[PDB]
Amino acid sequence: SMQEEDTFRELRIFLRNVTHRLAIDKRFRVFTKPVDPDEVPDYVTVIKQPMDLSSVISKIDLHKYLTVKDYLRDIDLICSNALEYNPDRDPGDRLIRHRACALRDTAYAIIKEELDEDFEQLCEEIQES
Numbered sequence: 001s002m003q004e005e006d007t008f009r010e011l012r013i014f015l016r017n018v019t020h021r022l023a024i025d026k027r028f029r030v031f032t033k034p035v036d037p038d039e040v041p042d043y044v045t046v047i048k049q050p051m052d053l054s055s056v057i058s059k060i061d062l063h064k065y066l067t068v069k070d071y072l073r074d075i076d077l078i079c080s081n082a083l084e085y086n087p088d089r090d091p092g093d094r095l096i097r098h099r100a101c102a103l104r105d106t107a108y109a110i111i112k113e114e115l116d117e118d119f120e121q122l123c124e125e126i127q128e129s
């Protein structure tokens with residue numbers, strides 16, 4: 001529909017504003033861009049679906065997210081990716097995991113405070129239709 005395309009447009013604008021805000025936070029600078037193939041050689045070893053905030057922006061612009069739940073699955077995957085690639089006790093692996101979870105917490109907190117439940121409900125009923 002033309003009204004249903006309005007509400008997906010509204011969704012994307014929201015997901016873009018949220019995503020921009022994770023991305024400009026110093027704590028999450030390591031989640032902004034794909035991991036450098038030189039800087040970290042053995043990443044593509046044990047992480048099978050890389051995900052990062054710039055790829056999330058590109059999935060929005062490509063109309064890949066029809067609901068917030070679908071967006072959050074990709075934030076979950078960033079956080080989940082970081083915990084899996086940094087499982088050691090080291091201070092380097094604990095700084096990264098803490099940042100990851102603070103990314104997840106911030107994303108969910110921003111949505112809980114600023115996305116009307118009903119708006120998300122309408123997004124799911126259109127997608128489910």
Ligand SMILES: CC(=O)c1csc(NC(=O)C(C)(C)N)n1
Pocket residue numbers: 030031035040081082083085086092093096
């Ligand atoms: C994106 C991500 O999960 C990531 C990027 S670099 C890194 N962590 C490390 O390179 C050390 C060895 C410091 N733990 N994690």
